Nucleic acid binder design. Sequence first.
DNA 1: AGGTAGTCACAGCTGATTGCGCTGAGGATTAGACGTGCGATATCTATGCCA
Length: 53
Amino acid sequence: LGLFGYWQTEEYQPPVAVDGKVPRNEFGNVYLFLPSMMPIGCVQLNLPNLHRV
DNA sequence: AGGTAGTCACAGCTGATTGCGCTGAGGATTAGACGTGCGATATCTATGCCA
């Protein structure tokens, strides 16, 4: 397991939603450990059953 | 007076229907570090020996 140092890591730049498409990771989701990780043009909503709508 | 076309009333053909089965998205959920008792290893040095 490669433990990279602070000098080897710069910064995570969140993507930008294009043409009404939400960017997704390799697994089809978005990592939202921090608010800055949210892609530009995206909003997180805590609405139950929102995906069905 | 004579006859066959328009029309209405009972038969076949077919899609909708009520029993049942799959998918896809929700809400619930042990193997190193840190410290310790123990067992093997170091070490400073008081004292008696002869040349």
